[PDB]
Symmetry: D2
Subunit: 352 residues, 4 copies
C-alpha cells in the first residue's frame, strides 16, 4: 500500500477480501525479492544428539506402537513446524532396530538412503534385494516398490532423503501399498542392478533404453573411496582432476545418461585435504551435507560452526557457504539443484 | 495411534529443544494416495473482475508497484496464489500510464483481453498489444510498458511467482536504464515466418524469442483445424475440439521453462471427456459461453471468466455456443521432473 | 619410404590372395592433411539446363516420366553425383503429365523454379507447387504427382542418393494405393504454418518436418524483414547486407530432414561474402538477380537460374551485382551429427 | 529408354554439359533393399598372424614400417583396402622396442589388443597401457603415438572410419612435436572415469567421444560372467538366451564410444545359436576366444580363435557357438542411427 488511506480506499480492499482478490501493490516486496530470502534458515544438527535421540526412540517406540516409521525428520526452525529441512527436501535419521522389517510400498516422491552405521540390512527395490553398509548410497527412485529387512541383531541407522516437501507443496504425490504378496528376502552381497550396471564404461545390450532414474541400486563406499583417493593422487602428481585445490569430489550419476541419480535430487560426495578452505559460494536452491569422516567447520552467513563425524547441516538458497577442513574431511551431499537446473533458475556466485 | 503416553515426553522435550519432528507422531497424510491440494477449484466472474479493475484505476493512483488484481485461491491461506505454482492477476492500465523497466527471474506472460495501443518493451524491443494477443516476458528480460492512448487496457498477468517464492528462486533488478511504436516487434519480424529460422538465430533459446503470439494466427489456426475436421481429416484433439500450444520456435517446446500456454476452441455443444491431471491449470473464457465441471460440480461460464483447476481435480468443459478458451498451466514443471500423470474418462 | 624386392615380392603376393592391403604401400592422401575431394567446383548455366530440359521434353515422352537431368560432377567418374553426398537434377514435367506413387529411404526435396498448377501428393496429402516453393518428400513417405495444366514445370530435385548408395542404406517400394484433389494449401501446412503455434494433435516430435511446402511468400517476407531490420540499425542479418534463413523442422527447430540442410540467402546489391572453408558439400541455385562465385580463387559470373557446387573445404565467397537471391542445400546435417563439421572464415 | 534418331546428338550435349539423365540408369541406384558392393568375407587369424610376422623383419622402422598395419581389404570394394564401405580394419604388428611419433586426425580410431603387453599408446599426453583384451580409443582429433617398452612384439586390431571419411571428404591430419614416455599401470583417464556410477566434479561437461582411454579386459570379462550367472539364477540380463553382451559406452552420455563407431562384446554359451539378423550398415567381428561358426547368406564358415569377418549391410547373419564363444564387435551403426537409416529384421519375429 501507498495509496493515501481513505474511507473509499478501505471500501475497495473490503471488496477484494470479499472476491478473493489480493492486490499486487500492497504486496510485500518479499513477493519478488531482489535475491532469494528463504523462510528456511541455516542450521546444524550434532550427530551425538541425533544418535542419542535415535537410540532412545528404539527403546520406546516399538513395532505396533510408533516404530515402523521410526525416522527422525530434521525440521528447519524457519519452516513453521513443517518437518522440512529445506523448502524442497526431507532429511531424516531412520533407526532400524534388531530383526525389524518394513512392508513394501511405492510413491511418486523420489528417495535415497545413505547408510551411516550398521550392516546386514537389505532394502528390496522392485524385487531386487540390495545389501546396506556404512558409506553406501541407495536409491529408491519414485514409483519403485521398496521395503526392507534387518537380518541382524544389531541396529542400523541411515539418512533418509526425499523430495517430500517439494511434492507436498506442488501437489505431486501418489502412494500405493504392496499387494499381500510375499517378500521372501534373498540375501545377496550385490543386487542384480549392480551386477549389471557397475562395470565402468560398459552397458548391457538388454539395457539400451535410457531411464529417468538410475538403475544402480547402491553406489557402494569402496568405489566412492577409490575415486576420491585417485583424484587426490592425481593432484599430488600435478595432474588435473580435483574441482579446486585439495578438493576431491564426485557426483553420483545415472549411468544411462551421465545426469543426476533422480529427477529431483542431486547426490555428491566431497573429500577435502586437511587444511583446505573452500571458496565462499552463493547457490540457488538448498543443499544438505553430512560429515561422513573427519572434522572441520562450516561458514554460513559469515558464522562458523565446528563439525564432527556425523553432523548434518543445510544451506538454504543463496546463503553464502564454505567449508574448512581440520582433518581430511569427507562429506556426503544432496541438493534440489536438478529442480533448479531443469527450470533454468540455477545461478552461482563464487567469492574467488 | 502412537506409543504409550509413558512420560517419554522427556524425549519429546528433547526433540523440540533441537529441531526433530518424528515421522511416527506425524501430521495428516504427508504422502497422499493421490494429490489433495490445499488449493481449491474456483471461478472468478469477469463482470466482477472488470468492475473491481475500473475501481482500482479511480482509486489507486499513477499506476502503483502496479495496478494488478491477483486472483487469490481461497484454500491457500491468504497468499495471493491462484494455484500453488502460478500467479494470475488482472492488470488495469489507465490512459497514458507507463511503467519503468524491471527484470526478474520469475517467468511471465501477458494475455490481452480488452484494449489496444499499448506497447510492452522487452529487452529494448517494443511489442504492441491487442485483444487476443499473448505476450511473453521470459525470466530475466527487462520489461516495461507505455499506454499510447486515452483508453484503458486490461490484460491477464501469468507468472510463476508462487513457485518462485516457495522454491527460493527469485531475483529482481530495477531498470529505467524506447517509446517507439511499431506494429510488430523485432522478434516477430524475425521469427514469425512459418517453418523459417534466421541464420543469425541458430542458437536454441531457453524461452521463446517470440514476443507476441498474435490473435490473427491463433484464430486462423483453430478455424483451420475445425475446417479440416469438417473435411473428414485428422486435426482436432478430440471431436469438435480444436486446440494449439504456443511454442518456442527454436525448440518446438513450451514458451517458457515453467509455464505452458494453450488455446482451445470448442464447437457449440461439445463436452470434453473428464480429466485428472497433475498440477494446476487456469483457463480464461475468451469468447462464447458454456460451463466447467470440477469435482462433479457445474459452473456456468461467460466471456471473460477465469477458473483454476488445482492438481488431480477431475474437470471437463461444456460448450453452449462456440467456446474459445485461453489456457496456461504448470505442466512444464511437472513434465521436466517426471511427475506428470494423466487420467482421461473416455479411456484415452 | 618403402621396403624393396626378393622375399618381399612373396609377401605382396600372399597379401593379394588373402585380401590384405598394407597401410604403407598406400597413398598419404588416404588420410589427407585436409579434405581434397574427388569432386570438383563447377557451375551449370541455367540457359543450358533449360534448353536441354525442353529438348528432353520433345524427344522423351511419358519412355519419359523419370525426366530429370542429374548434374554430374566431372570429378566423380561418371557417377551422376553433383557431390559425394548429393543428387541434384532438373526435373522437367510436361503438360498434363503424372507420376505414380513410390517411396524410398532416401530423403528428397523439390525446389520449384518455373511453373504452377502441379501437385505432389505426399502420404495422401496434396501439395500445390509454385515458383519459389520448397517441397519436402522425407525418407519413406509416399509421393507421386499430377500436372493439372497445359504448361510445363521445372524444379530442382535434391536427394541423398549418392550418400545412400555408397553407404548401403536404400530401400524402395512401389505404390498400389488410391487422390487427385486440388487444394490450394495442404493439410500439413494447414496445421503447421502458423508461427509459434503447435497443434495439440501434433505433440510428438518427428524426424523430418511435417511441413510439405515452405512457400515463397514467407521466405520472401522473412528476408525482406531481415534487410529492413538492418536498415533500422537492428541485429538480424547474418553478416552486413546478408539476409538468410534456414528451413527448419517446426517440431524441433532443426533441419528439414536428417540428411539435407536447406537455406535461402538474399544478398544486398554490392555485398561480398567473406571467404569460407566448410566441411562437406553445398549446392546453390541462383533464384533471382546476378553476381558471381569465387571458388579456389577463380571467379564465375552467375545469372538467374545457374547452379554451382562447392565440394568439401573448397574456399568460397559470393559477390552480388544486383540484389542476389540464392537457394542452398548441403550435407551439413551429416557432417554435424557426426562431429566432422569444421569451419574457417577469412576475417574470422 | 526411348528411340535413336537425333536422340544420340542430345546425349552428346549431355556429355559436353556434364549431365547424366535420370532415365538411362541401373535401377539399383535406388535398390529394393541394400545390395552392397562389399561382400561377406572371413580372414583366418593363423594367416593374419603369419603375414604379420613376415612383415616383421621385411618392412622395418624407416622404409615403410612405422605404418606396419595390414588392412583387410574387402574383395568387393575394387582394391580399396576397405573392409566395409565405412570402416578400415587392419592388424597392426608392433615389433620389439618400436615407437611411433604423435599424429592427430579427424577420423575416429580404436585399438583392440589381441596378443602382447607392455606397450603404451599416449593419448593427448596421457599414457595408456595395452594388454590382450583391452579396447583403446583414440577419438578423432586426439594426439596419439606409442612406444613398445618390451623385447616382445604386440598385435592389435586397428579400427577406423577411414573409408567413411575419405568418401565423405571429412579428413584432416596434423603431425605433432610434441611427448612423455612415463609407464603408469592405468591412464589418468581411467583413474578419473573408471569408478562405476561416479563422475568427477571436474568433468561435468559432456564430451563427444568417451574420455575412457582403455576399457580393460578385467571389467569386460566380469560383466559378461555376471550376465551368464544372472541367467543361471533365473534373472533377466542376457540379450537372448545363452547370449551375454555389453556395449562399450561413453560414460558422460551412455551413448557410443565415438560419433561414428559402435563397439560391443559378446559371450555365447556353448551350443548357442543366435537368431538370424538383417541390419542396415556394416559390422566386423573378431573371435577373441573359443570356437564356433558364422552363417552369412545361408553359408556356414567355421571360426577359430582370432578369426575376423565382416557382415556388409543387410546381409542376414547368425553366430553358432561350439565352445564358449567370445566375440569383439564394431559397427558403423552410430552413423546409421544418427541419420535414421537404421532398420533391423530379426528372425524370431
Ligand atoms: Cl546390437
Ligand atoms: Cl493437453
Ligand atoms: Cl554457411
Ligand atoms: Cl557442485
Ligand atoms: Fe518409502
Ligand atoms: Fe514484471
Ligand atoms: Fe521419389
Ligand atoms: Fe593414427
Amino acid at each position: 500500500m501507498q495509496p493515501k488511506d481513505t474511507p473509499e480506499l478501505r471500501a475497495l480492499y473490503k471488496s477484494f477480501e470479499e472476491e478473493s482478490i489480493i492486490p499486487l501493490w500492497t504486496q510485500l516486496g518479499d513477493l519478488m525479492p531482489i535475491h532469494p530470502k528463504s523462510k528456511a534458515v541455516p542450521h546444524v544438527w550434532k550427530w551425538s544428539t541425533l544418535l542419542r535421540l535415535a537410540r532412545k526412540s528404539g527403546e520406546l517406540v516399538p513395532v505396533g506402537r510408533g516404530g515402523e516409521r521410526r525416522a527422525l525428520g530434521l525440521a528447519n526452525p524457519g519452516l513453521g513446524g513443517n518437518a522440512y529441512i529445506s523448502p524442497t527436501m526431507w532429511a531424516g535419521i531412520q533407526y532400524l532396530g534388531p530383526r525389524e522389517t518394513a512392508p513394501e510400498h511405492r510413491h511418486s516422491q523420489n528417495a535415497f538412503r545413505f547408510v551411516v552405521e550398521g550392516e546386514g540390512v537389505w532394502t528390496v527395490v522392485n524385487g531386487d534385494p540390495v545389501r546396506m553398509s556404512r558409506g553406501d548410497l541407495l536409491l529408491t527412485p519414485g514409483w519403485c516398490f521398496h521395503g526392507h529387512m534387518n537380518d541382524t541383531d544389531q541396529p542400523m541407522a541411515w539418512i533418509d532423503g526425499l523430495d517430500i516437501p517439494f511434492s507436498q507443496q506442488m501437489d505431486v504425490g501418489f502412494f500405493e501399498f504392496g499387494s499381500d504378496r510375499v517378500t521372501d528376502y534373498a540375501t545377496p552381497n550385490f543386487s542384480r542392478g549392480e551386477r549389471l550396471w557397475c562395470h565402468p564404461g560398459l552397458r548391457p545390450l538388454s539395457g539400451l533404453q535410457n531411464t529417468v532414474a538410475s538403475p544402480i541400486g547402491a553406489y557402494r563406499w569402496e568405489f566412492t573411496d577409490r575415486a576420491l583417493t585417485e583424484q587426490l593422487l592425481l593432484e599430488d602428481e600435478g595432474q588435473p582432476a580435483t574441482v579446486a585445490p585439495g578438493h576431491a569430489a564426485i557426483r553420483y550419476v545415472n549411468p544411462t545418461t551421465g545426469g543426476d541419480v533422480m529427477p529431483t535430487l542431486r547426490c555428491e560426495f566431497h573429500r577435502l585435504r586437511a587444511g583446505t578452505e573452500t571458496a565462499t559460494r552463493n547457490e540457488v536452491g538448498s543443499t544438505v551435507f553430512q560429515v561422513f569422516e573427519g572434522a572441520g567447520a562450516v561458514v554460513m552467513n559469515g558464522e562458523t560452526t565446528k563439525l564432527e563425524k556425523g553432523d548434518m547441516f543445510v544451506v538454504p538458497s543463496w546463503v553464502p557457504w564454505s567449508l574448512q577442513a581440520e582433518t581430511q574431511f569427507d562429506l556426503f551431499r544432496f541438493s534440489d539443484a536438478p529442480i533448479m537446473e531443469a527450470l533454468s533458475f540455477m545461478r552461482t556466485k563464487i567469492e574467488g
